[PDB]
Amino acid sequence: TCPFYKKIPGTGFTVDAFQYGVVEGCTAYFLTHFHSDHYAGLSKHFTFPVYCSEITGNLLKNKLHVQEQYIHPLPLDTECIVNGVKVVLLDANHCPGAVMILFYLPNGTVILHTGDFRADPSMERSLLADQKVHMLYLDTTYCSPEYTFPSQQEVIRFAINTAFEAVTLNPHALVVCGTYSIGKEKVFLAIADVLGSKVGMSQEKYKTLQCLNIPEINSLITTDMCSSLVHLLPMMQINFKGLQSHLKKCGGKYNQILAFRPTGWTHSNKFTRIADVIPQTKGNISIYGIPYSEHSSYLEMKRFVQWLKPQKIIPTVNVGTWKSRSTMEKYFREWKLEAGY
Numbered sequence: 652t653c654p655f656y657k658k659i660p661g662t663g664f665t666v667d668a669f670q671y672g673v674v675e676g677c678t679a680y681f682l683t684h685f686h687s688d689h690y691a692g693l694s695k696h697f698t699f700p701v702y703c704s705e706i707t708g709n710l711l712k713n714k715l716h717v718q719e720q721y722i723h724p725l726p727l728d729t730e731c732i733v734n735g736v737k738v739v740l741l742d743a744n745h746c747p748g749a750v751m752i753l754f755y756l757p758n759g760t761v762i763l764h765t766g767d768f769r770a771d772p773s774m775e776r777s778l779l780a781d782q783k784v785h786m787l788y789l790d791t792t793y794c795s796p797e798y799t800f801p802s803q804q805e806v807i808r809f810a811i812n813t814a815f816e817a818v819t820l821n822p823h824a825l826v827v828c829g830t831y832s833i834g835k836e837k838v839f840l841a842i843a844d845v846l847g848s849k850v851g852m853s854q855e856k857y858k859t860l861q862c863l864n865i866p867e868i869n870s871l872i873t874t875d876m877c878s879s880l881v882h883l884l885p886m887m888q889i890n891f892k893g894l895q896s897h898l899k900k901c902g903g904k905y906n907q908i909l910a911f912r913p914t915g916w917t918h919s920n921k922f923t924r925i926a927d928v929i930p931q932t933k934g935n936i937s938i939y940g941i942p943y944s945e946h947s948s949y950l951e952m953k954r955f956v957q958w959l960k961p962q963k964i965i966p967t968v969n970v971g972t973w974k975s976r977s978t979m980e981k982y983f984r985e986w987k988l989e990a991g992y
């Protein structure tokens with residue numbers, strides 16, 4: 652059944668709650684972002700109002716074929732009324748079109764649901780600065796002090812320099828980047844840019860990217876593999892067998908693959924710096940795992956919460972085990988006692 656942490660008290664609203672059939676008493680289903688664990692259950696047969704960003708609405712319509720009459724896009728940073736309740740969508744710094752949702756309850760309670768987010772200090776100067784938030788539905792994906800990772804900017808710098816060096820040493824080297832969802836577009840677009848190439852990809856992936864309102868996108872991507880030296884493939888294909896196989900497909904245009912796997916966290920993060928990352932190599936194939944995250948690090952999450960000073964925190968991630976729940980609730984108390992709220 653729909654879990655409590657997907658329900659907004661004092662409303663008939665749910666967040667990211669599309670796989671439970673009809674939720675009894677739900678008058679509006681919000682969708683924070685177009686990732687499959689969150690949209691799971693939507694299709695062209697859905698007949699309730701779906702509230703979301705413009706970008707997420709483009710994907711619902713074009714990829715899932717949800718009918719237009721049930722899609723309600725809202726602009727960001729704007730006070731809107733939904734079934735008599737004031738709401739605001741904020742940028743979540745996750746994947747394209749991902750939002751956080753502020754709910755202003757009739758009784759005066761204010762609730763923020765982060766969806767999936769990567770906390771950033773820039774959020775401290777959004778509309779969130781303007782009033783008190785009482786309850787916080789928090790993306791706790793990496794809520795543990797072992798989770799460190801570099802900035803997105805540092806990771807892109809590393810990837811750009813690595814690709815540029817490799818291809819300039821060997822003009823017959825191919826660059827491949829793995830993907831399995833939207834998000835992390837900067838990795839493959841930054842690399843393509845430094846190499847003066849477009850990124851080539853399947854028709855399904857190209858369709859997905861054309862939904863995202865990225866400026867000058869027609870100048871950066873293509874379905875013509877042959878004219879591109881940065882290829883996107885399914886994450887599943889980013890391994891030695893899958894890459895040897897793909898190289899055979901290119902007809903001796905290339906004699907070397909340099910591949911990037913943008914992982915979340917991997918336990919090399921507890922020891923190694925970004926400057927010091929190395930690839931797995933077999934033959935003329937090298938695979939780099941790079942720690943490009945679109946979720947808060949532990950310290951980024953902690954700063955955001957200590958800034959916001961909520962009265963109650965409801966975790967939305969890692970809630971399935973007692974040990975995880977109890978560990979998170981410990982960190983939340985530490986944060987509160989350290990900051991004095």
Ligand code: NI
Pocket residue numbers: 684686745767
């Ligand atoms: Ni997500």
